[PDB]
Amino acid sequence: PLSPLPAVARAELDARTEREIDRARLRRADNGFFRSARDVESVSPADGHAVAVWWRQMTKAFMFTTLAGLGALARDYARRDADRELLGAFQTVYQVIGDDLDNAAPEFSAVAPTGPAGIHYVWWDDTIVAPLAAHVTEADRRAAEELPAPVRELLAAMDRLAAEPLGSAVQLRVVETIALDIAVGFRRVYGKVLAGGEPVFGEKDQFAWIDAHIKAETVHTGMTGLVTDAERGEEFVRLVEEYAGLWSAALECFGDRLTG
Amino acid sequence: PLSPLPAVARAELDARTEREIDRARLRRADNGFFRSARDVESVSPADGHAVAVWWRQMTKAFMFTTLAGLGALARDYARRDADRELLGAFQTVYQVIGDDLDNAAPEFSAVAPTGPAGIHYVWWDDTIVAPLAAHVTEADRRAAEELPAPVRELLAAMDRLAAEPLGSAVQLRVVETIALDIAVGFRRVYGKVLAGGEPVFGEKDQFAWIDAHIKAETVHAAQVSDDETGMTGLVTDAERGEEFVRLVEEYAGLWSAALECFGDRLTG
Ligand SMILES: C/C=C1/CN[C@@H]1C(=O)O
Ligand SMILES: C/C=C1/CN[C@@H]1C(=O)O
Ligand SMILES: [Fe+2]
Ligand SMILES: [Fe+2]
Ligand SMILES: [Fe+2]
């Protein structure tokens, strides 16, 4: 006795989940980050650096708090009989976390560094943040570490989901929806960073983190498969609404930084 | 501002660790389960089934509580800033426990069923418990689910290490050391289970779970003792390391008693 909801109640949860993402204005043509990334003629080192620092911290927290949420679910399953449908969905979350922690998918391990240098927030720090940091003053660099409030609110939302047995499903459900558009926006943003009139990212291989995410998302037991009763279903939709809105406000904050 | 202990102080913790494993009597020649598995001549369907049920629940709890311990460490790392050598040993936990959940390593991915049927406690249930179950009575299947006290005490400790930031490191450092001996014990024991006159497990493929473990668990033991990306590489201060040895003692001890419980059931 433990199993997913029937496939009809689950499909309704998926449709309500898609509607929360619509209402949060996270779609490609909605969110100020994707619009700005398309619209701006150029991007200063300071602005690109700041956005890169915020992203580094957001993706580090996304990965660790998603794994923590999986652990919370594992605590439960240690003392229940999860059926095989449930276990398949648990495996999926594990496999997906593995992309960011160890480049599990072949599209990542074909280009990412091995060992801890390949952890996505570290690989980002090494190849995106550090070259930008060479073109900003030490005072600029300390200011960027002072995260804006919408970024702090999102990290606080992730800390709360780290304890939630549905937390890893909520986070992956939303992030996988928007990951493609974020990575395309980064490709465009850092393609437009000029320092000495010369591009800061002038070599193809410097975009390897971004192009790998674009490739993986283009090609890439779903997340509602971890919902085991009606009350959890309601809780899932509620956490998706909160989490999606915080993501949208954090990306609007990227967009704001690139404009005005 | 987070890093492991210096190499010297770590290889010292590694030595105190291998010594608590010694004292615990978990070595190939000191634990009653490994001796009995080799020594006994025959094992009844009912006795082999009972141990198979116990092992199912023990390994199920090991995987999930070790995963939960990794989650509790992740929750810490989301707040702090772990240097790369810490992150490296973190990756090892994810990689090692990942085989029980996903059969990533090549020894397993060849033979393991795909998807959830390959989860190791499920694969054990399907290929060891179930064939035995067909040769025991309903009352035997009921009685085997009521776990003996030494097994329950181990499970209860895993439930506590599940919320411990050092919990995955403790459990993997001990279990991966003894895993090979346990798997070799099971190969002996379930070769000697006879029902109706002849063995329950006749074909070589019926040992797939055990055989794959005998091969793979050599490298897993080497992964948890590696002096760069090994389990003591997750210890960040001298106090934490003291807690590590306290918990390894507790855990190696409960693992030894639980395994002796297997041996007694096999002998009488
Ligand atoms: C934060 C979401 C992401 C998809 N994997 C990306 C990363 O590593 O940043
Ligand atoms: C319990 C320890 C083990 C090594 N992996 C084995 C299993 O799945 O049982
Ligand atoms: Fe990633
Ligand atoms: Fe295993
Ligand atoms: Fe192992």
Side-chain angles (χ1 to χ4, degrees):
Chain A
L2 194 66
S3 74
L5 284 177
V8 181
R10 258 195 275 113
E12 172 64 2
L13 294 176
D14 282 332
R16 293 165 67 188
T17 288
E18 287 304 306
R19 280 203 291 282
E20 289 310 325
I21 288 161
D22 298 339
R23 279 192 244 241
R25 288 305 174 171
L26 280 173
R27 299 300 180 179
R28 177 181 289 184
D30 294 336
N31 192 284
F33 175 57
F34 317 134
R35 182 173 70 228
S36 298
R38 281 186 297 264
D39 283 359
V40 290
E41 293 177 350
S42 61
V43 175
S44 68
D47 286 344
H49 177 264
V51 165
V53 167
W54 309 343
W55 180 253
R56 183 188 67 202
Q57 302 301 117
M58 283 152 72
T59 182
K60 166 186 159 160
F62 158 73
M63 180 191 72
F64 282 122
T65 61
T66 299
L67 184 46
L70 184 59
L73 188 53
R75 279 201 200 62
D76 286 352
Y77 285 18
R79 292 297 214 170
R80 299 223 188 53
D81 303 300
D83 77 356
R84 298 206 187 200
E85 271 207 296
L86 266 186
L87 290 171
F90 187 102
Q91 282 181 315
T92 294
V93 171
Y94 199 67
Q95 292 155 176
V96 176
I97 285 164
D99 287 346
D100 276 69
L101 180 52
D102 208 17
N103 296 293
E107 298 87 358
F108 289 120
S109 50
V111 289
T114 49
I119 297 164
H120 283 187
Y121 81 87
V122 180
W123 183 18
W124 176 264
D125 199 25
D126 281 350
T127 61
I128 307 301
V129 179
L132 288 154
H135 295 275
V136 311
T137 62
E138 166 72 26
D140 285 336
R141 195 233 77 212
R142 288 188 256 94
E145 213 90 30
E146 285 307 302
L147 306 180
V151 170
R152 299 201 64 212
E153 284 186 48
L154 175 60
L155 301 175
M158 295 165 167
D159 273 347
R160 296 191 306 269
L161 289 174
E164 284 279 18
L166 285 185
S168 82
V170 168
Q171 290 210 65
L172 296 178
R173 185 52 167 73
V174 173
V175 166
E176 293 270 74
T177 292
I178 63 174
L180 177 60
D181 290 315
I182 296 174
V184 173
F186 286 149
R187 234 291 176 182
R188 294 166 180 168
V189 163
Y190 295 106
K192 293 184 234 181
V193 177
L194 294 185
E198 302 299 291
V200 167
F201 302 86
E203 307 325 308
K204 183 270 181 93
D205 284 341
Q206 292 193 264
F207 290 90
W209 188 108
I210 300 167
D211 291 342
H213 278 86
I214 292 170
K215 201 175 187 87
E217 297 303 329
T218 291
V219 175
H220 278 41
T221 54
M223 283 314 131
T224 44
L226 292 166
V227 169
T228 57
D229 68 42
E231 187 272 320
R232 296 292 80 216
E234 294 310 304
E235 184 69 354
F236 179 81
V237 179
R238 178 184 83 70
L239 294 166
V240 163
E241 162 170 357
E242 180 190 5
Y243 186 69
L246 294 181
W247 257 104
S248 193
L251 290 182
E252 291 297 335
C253 182
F254 289 9
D256 274 8
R257 185 70 195 236
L258 298 170
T259 62
Chain B
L2 206 69
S3 36
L5 292 183
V8 168
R10 268 195 292 116
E12 219 263 341
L13 273 197
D14 270 353
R16 297 171 62 175
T17 278
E18 296 288 8
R19 253 137 57 203
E20 290 277 359
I21 292 177
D22 292 329
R23 173 153 96 153
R25 305 185 19 152
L26 278 173
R27 302 296 175 172
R28 194 189 200 116
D30 310 340
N31 196 271
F33 171 64
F34 311 129
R35 299 193 262 92
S36 293
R38 179 202 57 222
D39 283 359
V40 301
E41 281 181 337
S42 206
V43 174
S44 53
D47 288 337
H49 168 270
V51 167
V53 174
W54 303 346
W55 177 254
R56 186 191 59 206
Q57 303 304 110
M58 287 162 61
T59 205
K60 169 197 190 172
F62 159 70
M63 174 187 85
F64 280 121
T65 65
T66 293
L67 232 13
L70 176 68
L73 189 55
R75 188 174 202 178
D76 279 10
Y77 283 15
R79 307 152 145 290
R80 262 129 289 179
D81 192 65
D83 80 359
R84 304 204 178 184
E85 313 95 53
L86 272 203
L87 296 173
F90 192 95
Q91 283 179 312
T92 308
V93 176
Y94 172 91
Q95 296 158 349
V96 163
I97 200 48
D99 289 325
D100 287 74
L101 176 60
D102 207 16
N103 299 289
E107 308 83 349
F108 293 121
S109 45
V111 298
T114 56
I119 298 164
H120 286 192
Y121 79 85
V122 181
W123 184 20
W124 175 269
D125 201 32
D126 285 349
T127 65
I128 307 285
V129 175
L132 288 174
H135 301 296
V136 304
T137 71
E138 185 56 41
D140 293 329
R141 296 188 294 262
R142 284 321 84 202
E145 313 266 83
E146 301 291 298
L147 305 183
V151 171
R152 291 204 302 294
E153 272 155 45
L154 178 63
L155 293 207
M158 293 170 160
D159 280 343
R160 300 185 306 259
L161 296 167
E164 253 309 310
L166 281 165
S168 64
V170 179
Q171 295 204 62
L172 281 193
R173 186 54 169 78
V174 166
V175 167
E176 298 312 315
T177 315
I178 59 158
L180 179 283
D181 298 328
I182 297 175
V184 152
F186 287 152
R187 235 287 183 181
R188 303 178 175 176
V189 163
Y190 292 106
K192 296 193 260 234
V193 163
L194 320 170
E198 70 305 343
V200 179
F201 304 102
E203 311 313 321
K204 180 260 202 316
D205 272 359
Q206 305 191 230
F207 291 80
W209 188 108
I210 305 177
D211 291 334
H213 270 81
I214 289 166
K215 295 181 198 113
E217 294 305 308
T218 304
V219 317
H220 278 204
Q223 285 173 272
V224 310
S225 54
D226 184 289
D227 41 7
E228 288 170 280
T229 63
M231 291 304 101
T232 45
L234 286 175
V235 170
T236 58
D237 59 51
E239 176 275 282
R240 264 309 87 175
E242 286 297 295
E243 182 63 350
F244 186 76
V245 173
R246 184 190 98 88
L247 290 173
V248 159
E249 163 168 82
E250 196 199 3
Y251 187 74
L254 300 188
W255 253 105
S256 208
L259 276 175
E260 289 295 352
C261 183
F262 287 12
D264 295 355
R265 182 62 183 251
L266 285 160
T267 85

PDB file of all heavy atoms in Angstrom, chain A residues 195-216:
ATOM      1  N   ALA A 195      33.992  43.870 -23.786  1.00  0.00           N
ATOM      2  CA  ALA A 195      34.839  44.653 -22.900  1.00  0.00           C
ATOM      3  C   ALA A 195      35.598  45.741 -23.635  1.00  0.00           C
ATOM      4  O   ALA A 195      35.280  46.929 -23.506  1.00  0.00           O
ATOM      5  CB  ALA A 195      35.858  43.777 -22.163  1.00  0.00           C
ATOM      6  N   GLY A 196      36.585  45.357 -24.430  1.00  0.00           N
ATOM      7  CA  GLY A 196      37.428  46.385 -25.010  1.00  0.00           C
ATOM      8  C   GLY A 196      36.909  46.653 -26.403  1.00  0.00           C
ATOM      9  O   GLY A 196      37.692  46.735 -27.351  1.00  0.00           O
ATOM     10  N   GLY A 197      35.585  46.635 -26.534  1.00  0.00           N
ATOM     11  CA  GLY A 197      35.002  46.630 -27.881  1.00  0.00           C
ATOM     12  C   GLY A 197      35.040  45.175 -28.316  1.00  0.00           C
ATOM     13  O   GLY A 197      34.203  44.790 -29.140  1.00  0.00           O
ATOM     14  N   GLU A 198      35.959  44.391 -27.737  1.00  0.00           N
ATOM     15  CA  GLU A 198      36.127  42.958 -28.078  1.00  0.00           C
ATOM     16  C   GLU A 198      35.241  42.069 -27.197  1.00  0.00           C
ATOM     17  O   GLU A 198      35.041  42.381 -26.011  1.00  0.00           O
ATOM     18  CB  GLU A 198      37.581  42.544 -27.867  1.00  0.00           C
ATOM     19  CG  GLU A 198      38.562  43.366 -28.679  1.00  0.00           C
ATOM     20  CD  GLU A 198      38.356  43.248 -30.178  1.00  0.00           C
ATOM     21  OE1 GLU A 198      38.623  42.160 -30.723  1.00  0.00           O
ATOM     22  OE2 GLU A 198      37.921  44.241 -30.794  1.00  0.00           O
ATOM     23  N   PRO A 199      34.686  40.979 -27.753  1.00  0.00           N
ATOM     24  CA  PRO A 199      33.803  40.109 -26.968  1.00  0.00           C
ATOM     25  C   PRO A 199      34.588  39.433 -25.853  1.00  0.00           C
ATOM     26  O   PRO A 199      35.711  38.976 -26.043  1.00  0.00           O
ATOM     27  CB  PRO A 199      33.273  39.093 -27.988  1.00  0.00           C
ATOM     28  CG  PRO A 199      33.940  39.408 -29.308  1.00  0.00           C
ATOM     29  CD  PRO A 199      34.668  40.700 -29.202  1.00  0.00           C
ATOM     30  N   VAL A 200      33.992  39.397 -24.667  1.00  0.00           N
ATOM     31  CA  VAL A 200      34.610  38.650 -23.579  1.00  0.00           C
ATOM     32  C   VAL A 200      34.588  37.163 -23.883  1.00  0.00           C
ATOM     33  O   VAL A 200      35.500  36.428 -23.486  1.00  0.00           O
ATOM     34  CB  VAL A 200      33.899  38.980 -22.251  1.00  0.00           C
ATOM     35  CG1 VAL A 200      34.294  37.993 -21.154  1.00  0.00           C
ATOM     36  CG2 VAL A 200      34.192  40.417 -21.855  1.00  0.00           C
ATOM     37  N   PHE A 201      33.554  36.679 -24.579  1.00  0.00           N
ATOM     38  CA  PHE A 201      33.494  35.264 -24.934  1.00  0.00           C
ATOM     39  C   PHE A 201      33.718  35.174 -26.444  1.00  0.00           C
ATOM     40  O   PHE A 201      32.774  35.125 -27.236  1.00  0.00           O
ATOM     41  CB  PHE A 201      32.191  34.629 -24.474  1.00  0.00           C
ATOM     42  CG  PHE A 201      31.970  34.739 -22.984  1.00  0.00           C
ATOM     43  CD1 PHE A 201      31.384  35.870 -22.436  1.00  0.00           C
ATOM     44  CD2 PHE A 201      32.370  33.728 -22.136  1.00  0.00           C
ATOM     45  CE1 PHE A 201      31.193  35.989 -21.075  1.00  0.00           C
ATOM     46  CE2 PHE A 201      32.159  33.829 -20.769  1.00  0.00           C
ATOM     47  CZ  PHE A 201      31.580  34.965 -20.233  1.00  0.00           C
ATOM     48  N   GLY A 202      34.988  35.164 -26.833  1.00  0.00           N
ATOM     49  CA  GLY A 202      35.354  35.157 -28.233  1.00  0.00           C
ATOM     50  C   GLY A 202      35.674  33.783 -28.799  1.00  0.00           C
ATOM     51  O   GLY A 202      35.867  33.667 -30.014  1.00  0.00           O
ATOM     52  N   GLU A 203      35.755  32.746 -27.957  1.00  0.00           N
ATOM     53  CA  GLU A 203      35.969  31.370 -28.412  1.00  0.00           C
ATOM     54  C   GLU A 203      34.716  30.525 -28.192  1.00  0.00           C
ATOM     55  O   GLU A 203      34.131  30.547 -27.104  1.00  0.00           O
ATOM     56  CB  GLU A 203      37.154  30.701 -27.691  1.00  0.00           C
ATOM     57  CG  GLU A 203      38.472  31.469 -27.727  1.00  0.00           C
ATOM     58  CD  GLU A 203      38.694  32.238 -29.026  1.00  0.00           C
ATOM     59  OE1 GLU A 203      38.583  31.634 -30.126  1.00  0.00           O
ATOM     60  OE2 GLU A 203      39.006  33.452 -28.940  1.00  0.00           O
ATOM     61  N   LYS A 204      34.342  29.763 -29.223  1.00  0.00           N
ATOM     62  CA  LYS A 204      33.215  28.837 -29.189  1.00  0.00           C
ATOM     63  C   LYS A 204      33.187  27.996 -27.915  1.00  0.00           C
ATOM     64  O   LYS A 204      32.160  27.930 -27.233  1.00  0.00           O
ATOM     65  CB  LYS A 204      33.268  27.934 -30.431  1.00  0.00           C
ATOM     66  CG  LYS A 204      32.110  26.958 -30.583  1.00  0.00           C
ATOM     67  CD  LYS A 204      32.349  25.609 -29.911  1.00  0.00           C
ATOM     68  CE  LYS A 204      31.167  24.633 -30.108  1.00  0.00           C
ATOM     69  NZ  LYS A 204      31.307  23.724 -31.296  1.00  0.00           N
ATOM     70  N   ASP A 205      34.313  27.355 -27.571  1.00  0.00           N
ATOM     71  CA  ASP A 205      34.351  26.478 -26.405  1.00  0.00           C
ATOM     72  C   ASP A 205      34.058  27.220 -25.105  1.00  0.00           C
ATOM     73  O   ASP A 205      33.774  26.582 -24.093  1.00  0.00           O
ATOM     74  CB  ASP A 205      35.720  25.786 -26.311  1.00  0.00           C
ATOM     75  CG  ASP A 205      35.876  24.631 -27.322  1.00  0.00           C
ATOM     76  OD1 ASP A 205      34.858  24.110 -27.847  1.00  0.00           O
ATOM     77  OD2 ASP A 205      37.037  24.249 -27.610  1.00  0.00           O
ATOM     78  N   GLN A 206      34.101  28.544 -25.105  1.00  0.00           N
ATOM     79  CA  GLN A 206      33.762  29.259 -23.888  1.00  0.00           C
ATOM     80  C   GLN A 206      32.278  29.163 -23.552  1.00  0.00           C
ATOM     81  O   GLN A 206      31.907  29.400 -22.396  1.00  0.00           O
ATOM     82  CB  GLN A 206      34.174  30.722 -24.011  1.00  0.00           C
ATOM     83  CG  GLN A 206      35.660  30.939 -24.057  1.00  0.00           C
ATOM     84  CD  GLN A 206      35.982  32.402 -23.868  1.00  0.00           C
ATOM     85  OE1 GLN A 206      36.169  33.133 -24.836  1.00  0.00           O
ATOM     86  NE2 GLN A 206      35.996  32.851 -22.604  1.00  0.00           N
ATOM     87  N   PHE A 207      31.427  28.829 -24.525  1.00  0.00           N
ATOM     88  CA  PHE A 207      29.992  28.660 -24.303  1.00  0.00           C
ATOM     89  C   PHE A 207      29.607  27.220 -23.962  1.00  0.00           C
ATOM     90  O   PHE A 207      28.416  26.881 -24.023  1.00  0.00           O
ATOM     91  CB  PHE A 207      29.203  29.116 -25.542  1.00  0.00           C
ATOM     92  CG  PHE A 207      29.230  30.613 -25.770  1.00  0.00           C
ATOM     93  CD1 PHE A 207      30.223  31.198 -26.548  1.00  0.00           C
ATOM     94  CD2 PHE A 207      28.244  31.428 -25.231  1.00  0.00           C
ATOM     95  CE1 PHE A 207      30.237  32.570 -26.798  1.00  0.00           C
ATOM     96  CE2 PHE A 207      28.257  32.835 -25.472  1.00  0.00           C
ATOM     97  CZ  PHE A 207      29.255  33.394 -26.237  1.00  0.00           C
ATOM     98  N   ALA A 208      30.578  26.368 -23.616  1.00  0.00           N
ATOM     99  CA  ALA A 208      30.311  24.929 -23.567  1.00  0.00           C
ATOM    100  C   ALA A 208      29.237  24.593 -22.538  1.00  0.00           C
ATOM    101  O   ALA A 208      28.360  23.769 -22.804  1.00  0.00           O
ATOM    102  CB  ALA A 208      31.594  24.156 -23.279  1.00  0.00           C
ATOM    103  N   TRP A 209      29.272  25.242 -21.370  1.00  0.00           N
ATOM    104  CA  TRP A 209      28.221  25.025 -20.376  1.00  0.00           C
ATOM    105  C   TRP A 209      26.855  25.355 -20.959  1.00  0.00           C
ATOM    106  O   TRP A 209      25.886  24.593 -20.784  1.00  0.00           O
ATOM    107  CB  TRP A 209      28.493  25.891 -19.145  1.00  0.00           C
ATOM    108  CG  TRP A 209      27.610  25.659 -17.931  1.00  0.00           C
ATOM    109  CD1 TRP A 209      27.988  25.065 -16.759  1.00  0.00           C
ATOM    110  CD2 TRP A 209      26.252  26.091 -17.741  1.00  0.00           C
ATOM    111  NE1 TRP A 209      26.957  25.111 -15.857  1.00  0.00           N
ATOM    112  CE2 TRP A 209      25.877  25.718 -16.439  1.00  0.00           C
ATOM    113  CE3 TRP A 209      25.326  26.780 -18.536  1.00  0.00           C
ATOM    114  CZ2 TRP A 209      24.610  25.958 -15.935  1.00  0.00           C
ATOM    115  CZ3 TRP A 209      24.054  27.024 -18.016  1.00  0.00           C
ATOM    116  CH2 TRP A 209      23.716  26.612 -16.740  1.00  0.00           C
ATOM    117  N   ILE A 210      26.758  26.494 -21.656  1.00  0.00           N
ATOM    118  CA  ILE A 210      25.457  26.954 -22.132  1.00  0.00           C
ATOM    119  C   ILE A 210      24.965  26.084 -23.280  1.00  0.00           C
ATOM    120  O   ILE A 210      23.822  25.613 -23.266  1.00  0.00           O
ATOM    121  CB  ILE A 210      25.519  28.438 -22.532  1.00  0.00           C
ATOM    122  CG1 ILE A 210      25.928  29.292 -21.307  1.00  0.00           C
ATOM    123  CG2 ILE A 210      24.146  28.848 -23.086  1.00  0.00           C
ATOM    124  CD1 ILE A 210      26.324  30.728 -21.648  1.00  0.00           C
ATOM    125  N   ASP A 211      25.822  25.857 -24.292  1.00  0.00           N
ATOM    126  CA  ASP A 211      25.441  25.008 -25.427  1.00  0.00           C
ATOM    127  C   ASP A 211      25.089  23.591 -24.989  1.00  0.00           C
ATOM    128  O   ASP A 211      24.211  22.949 -25.587  1.00  0.00           O
ATOM    129  CB  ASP A 211      26.558  24.945 -26.468  1.00  0.00           C
ATOM    130  CG  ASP A 211      26.757  26.258 -27.198  1.00  0.00           C
ATOM    131  OD1 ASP A 211      25.838  27.094 -27.144  1.00  0.00           O
ATOM    132  OD2 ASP A 211      27.834  26.448 -27.828  1.00  0.00           O
ATOM    133  N   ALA A 212      25.773  23.065 -23.972  1.00  0.00           N
ATOM    134  CA  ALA A 212      25.398  21.730 -23.500  1.00  0.00           C
ATOM    135  C   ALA A 212      24.005  21.743 -22.879  1.00  0.00           C
ATOM    136  O   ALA A 212      23.199  20.847 -23.135  1.00  0.00           O
ATOM    137  CB  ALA A 212      26.439  21.193 -22.516  1.00  0.00           C
ATOM    138  N   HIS A 213      23.674  22.769 -22.096  1.00  0.00           N
ATOM    139  CA  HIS A 213      22.326  22.819 -21.542  1.00  0.00           C
ATOM    140  C   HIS A 213      21.271  22.975 -22.644  1.00  0.00           C
ATOM    141  O   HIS A 213      20.231  22.295 -22.626  1.00  0.00           O
ATOM    142  CB  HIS A 213      22.234  23.945 -20.502  1.00  0.00           C
ATOM    143  CG  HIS A 213      22.766  23.533 -19.159  1.00  0.00           C
ATOM    144  ND1 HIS A 213      24.101  23.617 -18.834  1.00  0.00           N
ATOM    145  CD2 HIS A 213      22.157  22.951 -18.099  1.00  0.00           C
ATOM    146  CE1 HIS A 213      24.287  23.150 -17.616  1.00  0.00           C
ATOM    147  NE2 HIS A 213      23.126  22.737 -17.151  1.00  0.00           N
ATOM    148  N   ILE A 214      21.527  23.856 -23.615  1.00  0.00           N
ATOM    149  CA  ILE A 214      20.613  24.001 -24.748  1.00  0.00           C
ATOM    150  C   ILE A 214      20.411  22.660 -25.453  1.00  0.00           C
ATOM    151  O   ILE A 214      19.275  22.248 -25.720  1.00  0.00           O
ATOM    152  CB  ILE A 214      21.124  25.079 -25.723  1.00  0.00           C
ATOM    153  CG1 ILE A 214      21.047  26.463 -25.055  1.00  0.00           C
ATOM    154  CG2 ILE A 214      20.258  25.062 -27.032  1.00  0.00           C
ATOM    155  CD1 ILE A 214      21.764  27.595 -25.865  1.00  0.00           C
ATOM    156  N   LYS A 215      21.510  21.964 -25.768  1.00  0.00           N
ATOM    157  CA  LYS A 215      21.409  20.658 -26.432  1.00  0.00           C
ATOM    158  C   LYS A 215      20.598  19.680 -25.599  1.00  0.00           C
ATOM    159  O   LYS A 215      19.693  19.016 -26.114  1.00  0.00           O
ATOM    160  CB  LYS A 215      22.789  20.058 -26.693  1.00  0.00           C
ATOM    161  CG  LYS A 215      22.818  18.986 -27.810  1.00  0.00           C
ATOM    162  CD  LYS A 215      24.259  18.545 -28.081  1.00  0.00           C
ATOM    163  CE  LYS A 215      24.382  17.614 -29.289  1.00  0.00           C
ATOM    164  NZ  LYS A 215      24.530  18.425 -30.540  1.00  0.00           N
ATOM    165  N   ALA A 216      20.909  19.582 -24.298  1.00  0.00           N
ATOM    166  CA  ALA A 216      20.223  18.610 -23.444  1.00  0.00           C
ATOM    167  C   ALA A 216      18.738  18.918 -23.323  1.00  0.00           C
ATOM    168  O   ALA A 216      17.915  18.001 -23.301  1.00  0.00           O
ATOM    169  CB  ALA A 216      20.874  18.561 -22.056  1.00  0.00           C
TER     170      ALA A 216
END
